[PDB]
Design a protein around this ligand. Sequence first.
Ligand code: B12
Ligand code: B12
Ligand code: 5AD
Ligand code: 5AD
Ligand code: CA
Ligand code: CA
Ligand code: CL
Ligand code: CL
Ligand code: CL
Ligand code: CL
Ligand code: CL
Ligand code: CL
Ligand code: K
Ligand code: K
Ligand code: K
Ligand code: K
Lengths: 178, 182, 136, 136, 551, 551
Amino acid sequence: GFLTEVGEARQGQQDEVIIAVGPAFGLAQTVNIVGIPHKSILREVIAGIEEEGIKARVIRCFKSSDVAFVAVEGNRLSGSGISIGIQSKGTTVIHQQGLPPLSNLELFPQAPLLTLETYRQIGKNAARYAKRESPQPVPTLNDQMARPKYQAKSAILHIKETKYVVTGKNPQELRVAL
Amino acid sequence: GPGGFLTEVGEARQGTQQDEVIIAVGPAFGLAQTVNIVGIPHKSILREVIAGIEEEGIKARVIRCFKSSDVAFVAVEGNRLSGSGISIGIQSKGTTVIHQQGLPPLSNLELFPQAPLLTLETYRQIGKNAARYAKRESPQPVPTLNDQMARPKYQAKSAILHIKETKYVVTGKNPQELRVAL
Amino acid sequence: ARVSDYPLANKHPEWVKTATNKTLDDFTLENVLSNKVTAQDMRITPETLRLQASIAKDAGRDRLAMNFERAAELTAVPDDRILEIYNALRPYRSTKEELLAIADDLESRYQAKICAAFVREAATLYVERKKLKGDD
Amino acid sequence: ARVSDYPLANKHPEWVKTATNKTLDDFTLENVLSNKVTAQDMRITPETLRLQASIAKDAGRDRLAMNFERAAELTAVPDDRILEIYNALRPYRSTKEELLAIADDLESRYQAKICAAFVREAATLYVERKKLKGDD
Amino acid sequence: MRSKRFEALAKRPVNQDGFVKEWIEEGFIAMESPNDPKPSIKIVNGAVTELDGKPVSDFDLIDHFIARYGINLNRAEEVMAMDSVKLANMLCDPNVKRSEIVPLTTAMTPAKIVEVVSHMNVVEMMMAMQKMRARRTPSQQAHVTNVKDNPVQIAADAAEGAWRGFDEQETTVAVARYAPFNAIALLVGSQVGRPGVLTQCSLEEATELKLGMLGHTCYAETISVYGTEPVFTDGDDTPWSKGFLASSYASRGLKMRFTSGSGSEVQMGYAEGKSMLYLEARCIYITKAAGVQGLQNGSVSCIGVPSAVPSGIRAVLAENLICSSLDLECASSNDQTFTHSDMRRTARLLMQFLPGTDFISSGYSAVPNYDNMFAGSNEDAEDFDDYNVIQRDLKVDGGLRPVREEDVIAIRNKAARALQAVFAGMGLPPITDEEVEAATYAHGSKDMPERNIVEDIKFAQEIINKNRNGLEVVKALAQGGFTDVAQDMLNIQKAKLTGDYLHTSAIIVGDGQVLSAVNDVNDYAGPATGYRLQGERWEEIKNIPGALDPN
Amino acid sequence: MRSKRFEALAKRPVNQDGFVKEWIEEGFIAMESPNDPKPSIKIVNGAVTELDGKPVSDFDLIDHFIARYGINLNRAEEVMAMDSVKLANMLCDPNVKRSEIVPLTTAMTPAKIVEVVSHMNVVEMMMAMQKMRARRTPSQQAHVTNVKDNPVQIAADAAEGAWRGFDEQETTVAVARYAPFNAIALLVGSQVGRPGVLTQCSLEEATELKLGMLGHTCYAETISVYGTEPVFTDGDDTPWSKGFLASSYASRGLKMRFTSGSGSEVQMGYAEGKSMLYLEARCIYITKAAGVQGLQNGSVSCIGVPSAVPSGIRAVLAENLICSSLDLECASSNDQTFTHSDMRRTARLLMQFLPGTDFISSGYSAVPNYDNMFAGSNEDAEDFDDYNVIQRDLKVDGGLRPVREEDVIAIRNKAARALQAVFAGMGLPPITDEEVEAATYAHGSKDMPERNIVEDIKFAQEIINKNRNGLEVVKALAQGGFTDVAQDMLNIQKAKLTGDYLHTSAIIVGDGQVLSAVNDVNDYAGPATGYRLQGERWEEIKNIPGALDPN
Ligand code: B12
Ligand code: B12
Ligand SMILES: C[C@H]1O[C@@H](n2cnc3c(N)ncnc32)[C@H](O)[C@@H]1O
Ligand SMILES: C[C@H]1O[C@@H](n2cnc3c(N)ncnc32)[C@H](O)[C@@H]1O
Ligand SMILES: [Ca+2]
Ligand SMILES: [Ca+2]
Ligand SMILES: [Cl-]
Ligand SMILES: [Cl-]
Ligand SMILES: [Cl-]
Ligand SMILES: [Cl-]
Ligand SMILES: [Cl-]
Ligand SMILES: [Cl-]
Ligand SMILES: [K+]
Ligand SMILES: [K+]
Ligand SMILES: [K+]
Ligand SMILES: [K+]
C-alpha cells in the first residue's frame, strides 16, 4: 500500500511529466511480470524524471486497461504533453499529446526485459522530451523467446488487470510513499 | 593402381595348425581404394591387425576374397581356411568382423559395424582379440563404438564406396593368399 | 470485363488512364525527371476500379466488388479528408451529429452515396453500442 | 471358421488344443511349477493353424491362409530339423538332390505335402538362378 | 533420488514453453467450447433477426456487420440445415470442386463453419486446404527488420530475401519515428533483389495509410480486426472504421488484407467466454463482409495463447482453412515465435507448408531472430538451409530456393549502394562506404556500424511533415547511377494505377506479370491435378548446397 | 570476403547431413526413375507370362515368387485397365472404402502400384494412409538397447517404455553372444511395465528363430527381404528360404513380420539401375506373396540413402502407403537416424504420425540415442516430452502418454528386482542391489556399473546350448516372490497357443485381449468417422507436465 489517491487529476506547469499507471498497479498486483516491485519501478521512473529537473506527477487511469489509452489520458492532462503509461505487468510507453492513441514516442513492448535501470532511463527520456530535447531513444530490447516464455502469463495478468476498469471514471492523482 | 602392397601368390590352402588367424580382405582392399571411409590407410589397418595377432603369439595369414564383396561372406571364406577356425574380414571402406567356423555366415564373434569410428588402436585390439579366440580364450570384447550420427554423416558415402567395391567381385574365384609388403 | 481481360497491365494497358487523363506509357523516367508527370498524375481512377469490380464479380467475388465500388467513390476525396473520415469512425472520436455531417458531405460534395450511407449506418449503431464521443 | 469366430481365445477357446492334447486352462502357474505341464506341452497344433487359415480366408487374406497351412504342416517337424531345412534353402548351401531329399523326407515322416512341394519348387528355380552349392 | 531420465527431459527446451490448462470462463480454450453458440440463423423480410442463437436486439457491432454484409442470406437457411459432417467431408473430398464449396461456405454463419471444420483432423484439413487455397501457386512472405532500425541493413536483407524467393516482404519499427526510412529501405532493397516484390511497413493504422499515400509502401497487411467488441475497441477501431479503411487503401490503388488470429481476445482481456476459434471465425467473417480480398491469420502474434492449450495448433490450421474456404486469400502466419523447441515449431509450420497456402508463412524472418522486430518468427534466416532441404525431401514447393553466396553478396552490395544513392540524392543523413561494406557481409545488426539515430529520425519525420513522395526516390536513383533500379521502382508505382494487384492473392512475378487467384485459379481435383512441383522450379529446389555428385 | 550470413548457415547441423545428386545408373534415385519398368501383366493358362515388361524367361527368383504368389490374378485385368490417376484419386478419396480398394490394389503389379502412388503428393498420401492402415487403432514400437548389452538396464528401460505406451519393444546386441540375456531382460521388463507388450530380439535369422523357439521372444520383425537377387543373396536368403522361415515362425505360434525398406539395394551395391521405390515395391510384394501378415518398411536402417536424394522422404511415405494398400500391417520406420537437424527429422516423422499407421514408429528409441544399438533412432528418450506436446498440439494419437516420474521409478525398480530374481533363480551371474538401484534411476548405460561381460556371455550361451526355455524364467519369478510377473509371463506364452495374434496387425491390449485388423478393422469414411482421438485417451494426452492452472 504505497499509492494513495489525492483526488481527481487536473490539467497541468509545463515542466512536468505524468506517469499514468493502470487500474490494478500497486493494488491487486504489486510486482510486474518478472517480479520487480511496483514500488521500485515508480521509484526509478520518478528519480529519472527528477534527475532532469522536471516534476513527476503520478495518476491512476480507469477507463481502459490498455497501456496506450492509459498513457493518452495522461498526456492530455500533462502540462508538457508528455506521459509515461505503465501496466501492472510492466509494459511501458512514452506518449505525446497529439499522436494517435496507438502511436507513441517510445515503446517498451516486452515487459520481461525491463530492468530498474531501464525504468529510470525511461523517466529520464520522458523528461527530456518534456524539455523539447531529442534524447537518444532507450536502446531496443528484443528477446525472441519472450513471447514463448511469457505471453500466456501476460494474457492472464492482463485479464486480471482488466477487472479494475471503470467506464467513465476520470484519472485520480496518486501520492507515492516516501 | 597406386599404393599397391598386396601380391597374390596363389590359391589359399586350408591351414592345419591351430595357431593362426586369417585376415580376409575384400576384392577391392588395397587396390581401387587405399584408405577406409575416414581416410585411414589400408596398409596401416593391416599393419595393426597383423601386429595384434602376432603379439598374442599367433600367426597372421592374409587372403583376398572374390566371390562376394559382403564382409561377412569374405570372413566366412577366411574362417573355412583358417587353421584355428578364426578369421577377420575387412572391407575396403573399413567394416570389420571377427568370425568363427561353424557360426551362421551373418553371425560372428565380434562385429565392428560403424567403420567411421574405428581407430588404428581399435584395429590392433581386433587383431589381439581374434588371436585370443584362436587360443580358446574368452577375451573381453572390444568396447562398443556407437555414434547415432555415423549413418547421417557416412551411410550414403558407405553405399557409394561399396558399389565401387562390388565391381571387383569374381564369381567362382577361390581366395588368393597375399604377400604383404610391410 | 471478364477474367480473360485480366490482368489489365498485360492484356489491355490502354484501358488504364489516370485522374488527369495520363496513360501508363506516359509514366517514364524521362517524364518523371522532367516533371511532365508528377505524383498528382499517378492515381487510380474510379473507372479502373469499376472495371476491376466487374472482373471481381465475374470471379464470384461480389463483396470484393462492393469494396471496389466504395473505393471508386473515395477516389474523389482528398488524402487529408480520407484520413479525417477514417479517424472519425474510430471509437469515441465523434458525436453522432459529426458522423451525420460527414455522411452529408460525402453525398452532396463527392456523390459518394454508398460511403455516405455506410457512415450514417455507423452513426446509428454507434449510438446503440456506445462508441461515440463521451461514451468511454 | 469366419471372422465372427475370432479371436478363438474369446469366441471358441475349446477349439484350441496343444500338441500333447492339453487345453488352455491346463497352463496354470501351479501346473508349471509342479512340472504337470512342460514346454513340450506348450506348442500350437496344425488344427489351430488351419482354423486361423480359414479365418484369414474369410478376412480376404488368401496368402496369409496359405502361410498358415504351411505352418500347420511344419508343427510336426522338430525344432532342430526346421532349422536344418531353413538353412538348406539359403543360397549356395545345398545341391539339387539334397533339397529333393528334404522334400521327400518332409512327406514320408510328416506328410508335409505343401511344404515338400515348396522345397521342390525352390530346388528347380535354384538351378536356373544358380543358387545351389558350387554356384558362387 | 532423481530419475536421470527425467532430469534429462527437464532440461529440454520444450519445457521452457508456456502451457496452461483450459480456462473456459476467460476463453483460454482453442476450439470446441461449451460456451460457444450453436449455429443458427433467422431471416425476416431479408434481414437477419437471429445469428448463432443471438437475437438482433442483442447484436454488437460485429454481429451487425456480419449479419448485414458477411453472409449470403439467399442460401443461409438451406446451408444451415445441411449436415456439418457431410460439409466437412465435401471440404476434403478431392472430387468436390472448390467452386462447389464457396457458394456453401459464403452462406454459413460463423458458428456453422466452425462446427464444420471441427469435425476434421489435421490431415483432412490439409487435404482440404490444398483445394481451397485461392491461388494455384503457393507463395511466401518475409520479415525484414533489425533492432536498430538500420536502413542500410534493411535494404541489404530485403535484397537477399527477394533473391531467395519471397514475393512479399514486411518491415516495422523499434522507434516509430523511423518508419519512413524503414519503408523506403525495404522498398529499394526488395526491388534490387527481385523487381516485383511487394513491401509493407506495419504501423498504427492512420500512420500506415499516410505512409502508403506518400508512395513508400506497396501494400498493407496488419489492418487488424478482432473478435469481440471490447477488444476491437481497445484496438482503436470498429468494423465500420476498418471497412472504411479497407476501401480507402483500394481507392489509392494499394493492395491490402486484414489481419486477425486466434487468441487476440484472450491476450487483450475480453474473450467473452468464447473459444479462440469461434472468435476467430467472427474475424474471418468481418474480413469477408468488408470486401477485403485476403487475411493474415493463424494466431499470428498471439500464438502463445492457442499453443498453450490442447488442440491449439490444430485450431490454427482450422482458422486458415476457414479463411481459404470463404474464398479469401490466406497469408497463413508461421511468422511468430511460440516455442523453444525446433521439433515443435516444425510441426506447427508443416500444417500450412505441406498443402500450400497463398503465403505459407506471412513473415518468415529473413534476419536472425535477435533482429526480428515482431519479437521473433517461427522461422528465421538461420533456418534457410533446413527449409530448402525439406522442400527437396518432400517435393513440396515452399516458395524459396537455394542461392549462391557470391550472388547474395553482389545483390546485398547493390542494394546498399542504391540506398546510399537515394539518401545522397534526397539530402538524408549519409550512408557511408563502411556501412555499405558492412551491410554487404552482415548476418545482422551486430555486424553494422552505429548510426546517429537522433539525426535519422529527424529526417525521417521530415519525409512525412513535408510530404516527400515516392517519385523523389525514383529521381534520386535515376540521377545517382541506378537508372535500372529507378525503372523498377517506377514500375512498382505504376502497379498502383491498374487495380490488378488488388485482387485475391495478387503478387507480381517475372517480368511485371501480375499473378493472382483470378489468372492462377486453383483447380485442384486430386492426384496429378492442380499445382504440382515440377520442371525448372523442381530443378531449382533440388540444387541444395552440399549435394555431392556421386559418379 | 565471406558473408557472415553464409558463415552462420554453414555451421547449421543440417549441413552435416549426407546429400547426393541423383545417380540413375546405380539406382541412387528415390522414385520415378527412367529405368523403372512400365506396368504390364500377361496371364496364360492362369499363370503370369510377363510381369512389368519382363518375360517369364527373364524372371529372377523375386519375379517368380511375386508372379506365382504375390498378385491377386482375380482382379488383375480390371485394375491394369484402370487409369493410374483415377486409382490414386481413389486412394485418398474419403468416400471410396478401404474394402473396395484392397481387391484392386492387391491385383496390381509392382510397377502399377508404384505408378499409382507416384501421382500423389505427401498430403494426398497421408489422406490415403489414414484410410488404408489395416488396424483402426494406431500403435507404437520402441527400441530397448544399450552399448553394454547390460540386462539390468534393458529390463528397467523396457518397463518404462511399456509404461509410456509402446505395444511392441525390440532389442538387439552389441555382442551377439549376449542375445539370450537381452531377450529375457526385455521380455521381463516389458511385462512388468504393461502385461501384453510384445518383444523381439533382432539377430541373424537362424539364431533369432532358435531364440524364439526357446520362448525368450514374443515375435520377430527383422526378417529381411530385398529387392534385387544379388542383394537378397548377400542377405543370405532367397524368397523361398524367407517364405519357409515365415511359416516356421507361425508353426511355433509366433507372430512375425518381414522387414524391407527403400535404399537397401543401393547400400548393398546392386540396385540394377532401378529407383528405390520400385525395388521396395518388389520387397512389399515378396512379403505379400510369402503370406506374411505385416511389414516394417519406410527405408528403416538405410534411410541415409533415400534421404540423400530428391523426394526421398516422400518416397518413404509412398512405400508405407503401398504396404498398407496391399492389406499388410505397416510398421512404418521412424526408427533410424538420418539427420543432424531437429527440423528435418520432425518433418520425416510427421508423414506417418499425422495419419497414423499400425506402428507410427517401428523403433522409437526408449533410450538416449548414444545407447541405441540400431545406430540411433529418429526419436529417442530425450524427445519424449516433445512427442507428447505435439500429440496435444495437433490432437493426434501418437500412441504414447505423459507419465509421472514417481511411477516410472517404481516400475523400473520392480523390473530390475524381477530380473534380479530371475538371475538368482536361474543361477546366472548375480544382479546386485547396487545395479538394481542404478537401473532404477539411470538415463542410460553411462549411469550403470560395469558388469562382467565375459561371465554374462558364458551363461547366456549356455541358455542356448542347454535349451533353457521360457518356463525356467516363469518358475524363477514365481519362486523369487514375483508371482504376478510370473503369471503375466505365462500369459504371454499362452498367446502362442491360440494363433489369434498371428493375424494382420495384432497386438495384445488390456487384459490379454488381442487387438488386430480382424476385430479392429479400419472403417475410415471421412471427417467424424474412423479412429478419432477423444474421451479418456484424449484426457490422457492433454495432461502434459507443466500445464499450469491459469486462475
Ligand atoms: C503481441 C503483439 C501485439 C498483439 C497484442 C497487443 C495487446 N495490446 O495485447 C496484437 C497483435 C493484438 C498487437 C496489436 C498492435 N500492435 Co503489436 N506487437 C506485438 C508484438 C509482436 C509482441 C509483443 C510481445 O508479445 N511481448 C512479450 C510480452 C510478454 O510482453 P508484454 O509487455 O506483456 O507485451 C505487451 C506489449 O507488446 C503490448 N503491445 C503490443 N503491441 C503494441 C502496440 C502499442 C502501440 C502498445 C502501446 C502496446 C503494444 O501487448 C503485449 C501484451 O499485452 C510486438 C513486437 C515486439 N517487438 O515486441 C508488436 C508491436 C509492439 N506492435 C506494434 C503495433 C504497431 C501494434 C498496433 C498499433 C498495430 C495496429 N494495426 O493497430 C496494435 C496496437 C493494439 C493495442 N491496443 O495495443 C508495433 C509497435 C511499433 C512502435 N514502435 O510503436 C510492434 C513493435 C510490431 C508490430 N508492428 O506489430 N500487437
Ligand atoms: C545399416 C545396417 C544394416 C543394413 C545394411 C547391411 C549391409 N551389409 O549393407 C541392413 C538393414 C541391410 C542390415 C542387415 C543386417 N544387419 Co545390420 N545393421 C545396420 C545398422 C543399423 C547401422 C550400420 C551403419 O549404418 N553404420 C554406419 C556405416 C557408415 O558404417 P559401415 O561400417 O559402412 O556400416 C556397414 C556395416 O554396419 C554393415 N553391416 C550392417 N549390418 C551388418 C551385420 C553383419 C553381421 C555384418 C558382418 C555387417 C553388417 O553394413 C553397413 C553398410 O555397409 C547396424 C547397427 C549398428 N549398431 O551399427 C546394424 C547391425 C550391425 N546389423 C545387425 C544384423 C543382425 C543384421 C543382419 C544379420 C540381420 C538379418 N535379418 O539378417 C543383416 C546382415 C545382412 C548383411 N549381409 O550384412 C546387427 C548385428 C548384431 C551383431 N552384434 O552381430 C546390428 C548391430 C543391429 C541390427 N539388429 O540391425 N543391417
Ligand atoms: C504484427 C501485426 O499484425 C497484426 N496482428 C498480429 N496478430 C494479430 C491477431 N491475433 N489479431 C489481430 N491482429 C494481429 C497487428 O496489427 C500487429 O501489429
Ligand atoms: C535393423 C534390422 O532390420 C532389418 N532392416 C532394416 N532396414 C532394412 C531394409 N531397408 N531392408 C531390409 N531389411 C532391413 C535388418 O534385419 C536389420 O538388421
Ligand atoms: Ca506478416
Ligand atoms: Ca523395429
Ligand atoms: Cl462474395
Ligand atoms: Cl491375399
Ligand atoms: Cl486442459
Ligand atoms: Cl478429429
Ligand atoms: Cl539431383
Ligand atoms: Cl506430386
Ligand atoms: K497497421
Ligand atoms: K481473433
Ligand atoms: K532377424
Ligand atoms: K528395399
